[PDB]
């Protein structure tokens, strides 16, 4: 034996970052280089929740001035802080 | 600080004139008003680059001293001695979420 090795809907949290990176790089090549959007990662899970809690104190992250589906989740709590 | 001592003497003359039998009204000595140590409010690391859960403990310890007037570890009472005015200057760099 040497173990069949998982596929791309079983592995996550390492493969999630890899695939997010792959999806991103594919998108920028398919656009032309005008769809630039740095960091297919950031933050973590628990550290991200702590940052989200701190946004209610009055701080912002970097996409507002007063993983990439984090923007949709984050807007919902950011608009609460504002 | 120095300016209150005028007011005391100006009023002392008026109340001495107001009664004709109260002669030589008393006052408290000058050093009870003058001394800044008889009132409540009279090496160092850059705290901003530190981790969060150490900064929190350091700032609560300093601010707790600042509540009773005595100067903290990173908050200096600016020498605006005298009247009912006072200012304080806090350490410039800290993590923003604590700082607000």
UniProtKB/Swiss-Prot annotation, chain A:
* Segments traversing the membrane: none
State the function annotated in the UniProt record.
Component of the gamma-tubulin ring complex (gTuRC) which mediates microtubule nucleation. The gTuRC regulates the minus-end nucleation of alpha-beta tubulin heterodimers that grow into microtubule protafilaments, a critical step in centrosome duplication and spindle formation.
The record describes its quaternary structure and partners as: Component of the gamma-tubulin ring complex (gTuRC) consisting of TUBGCP2, TUBGCP3, TUBGCP4, TUBGCP5 and TUBGCP6 and gamma-tubulin TUBG1 or TUBG2. TUBGCP2, TUBGCP3, TUBGCP4, TUBGCP5 and TUBGCP6 assemble in a 5:5:2:1:1 stoichiometry; each is associated with a gamma-tubulin, thereby arranging 14 gamma-tubulins in a helical manner. Gamma-tubulin at the first position is blocked by TUBGCP3 at the last position, allowing 13 protafilaments to grow into a microtubule.
Phylogenetic classification of the source organism: Eukaryota, Metazoa, Chordata, Craniata, Vertebrata
Tell where it localizes: Cytoplasm, Cytoskeleton, Microtubule organizing center, Centrosome
Q: What highest taxon heads this organism's lineage?
A: Eukaryota
Name it.
Answer: Gamma-tubulin complex component 6
Signal peptide boundaries: none
Give the UniProt family note: Belongs to the TUBGCP family.
Q: Which disease is it linked to?
A: Microcephaly and chorioretinopathy, autosomal recessive, 1: A syndrome characterized by microcephaly, cognitive impairment, underdeveloped retina and choroid, and epilepsy in some patients. The more anterior parts of the retina, near the periphery and pars plana, have a grayish hue and diminutive vasculature similar to retinopathy of prematurity. Visual impairment becomes evident during the first year of life.
Full-sequence portion shown in this chain: 305 to 405 of 1819
Swiss-Prot record, chain B:
Pathological condition linked to this protein in its record:
Cortical dysplasia, complex, with other brain malformations 15: An autosomal recessive disorder characterized by global developmental delay, variably impaired intellectual development, speech delay, facial dysmorphism, microcephaly, and varying degrees of cortical malformations including pachygyria, thin corpus callosum and subcortical band heterotopia. Most patients have generalized seizures.
Self-association state and partner proteins as the record states: Component of the gamma-tubulin ring complex (gTuRC) consisting of TUBGCP2, TUBGCP3, TUBGCP4, TUBGCP5 and TUBGCP6 and gamma-tubulin TUBG1 or TUBG2. TUBGCP2, TUBGCP3, TUBGCP4, TUBGCP5 and TUBGCP6 assemble in a 5:5:2:1:1 stoichiometry; each is associated with a gamma-tubulin, thereby arranging 14 gamma-tubulins in a helical manner. Gamma-tubulin at the first position is blocked by TUBGCP3 at the last position, allowing 13 protafilaments to grow into a microtubule.
Tissues and organs where the protein is expressed, per its UniProt entry: Ubiquitously expressed.
Q: Provide the gene name from the record.
A: TUBGCP2
Localization recorded for this chain is:
Cytoplasm, Cytoskeleton, Microtubule organizing center, Centrosome
Q: What is this protein called?
A: Gamma-tubulin complex component 2
As for family, the record states: Belongs to the TUBGCP family.
According to its UniProt entry, the function of this protein is described as: Component of the gamma-tubulin ring complex (gTuRC) which mediates microtubule nucleation. The gTuRC regulates the minus-end nucleation of alpha-beta tubulin heterodimers that grow into microtubule protafilaments, a critical step in centrosome duplication and spindle formation. Plays a role in neuronal migration.
Annotated organism of origin = Homo sapiens (Human)
């Amino acid at each position: 034996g040497h173990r069949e090795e998982p596929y791309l809907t079983e592995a996550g949290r390492d493969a999630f970052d890899k695939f997010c990176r792959l999806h991103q790089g594919e998108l920028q090549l398919l656009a032309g280089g005008v769809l630039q959007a740095p960091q297919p990662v950031l933050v973590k899970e628990c550290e991200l929740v702590k940052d989200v809690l701190n946004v209610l104190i009055g701080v912002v992250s970097a996409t507002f001035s007063l993983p990439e589906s984090i923007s949709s989740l984050l807007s919902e709590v950011a608009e609460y802080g504002t | 600080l120095q300016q209150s001592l005028e007011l005391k003497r100006k009023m002392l003359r008026d109340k001495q004139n107001k009664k004709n039998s109260g002669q030589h009204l008393p006052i408290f000595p000058a050093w009870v008003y003058e001394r800044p140590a008889l009132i409540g409010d009279f090496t160092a690391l850059p705290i901003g680059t530190l981790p969060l859960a150490s900064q929190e403990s350091a700032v609560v310890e300093d601010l707790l001293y600042v509540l009773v007037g005595v100067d903290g570890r990173y908050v200096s009472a600016q020498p605006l001695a005298g009247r009912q005015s006072r200012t304080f200057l806090v350490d410039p760099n800290l993590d923003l979420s604590i700082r607000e």
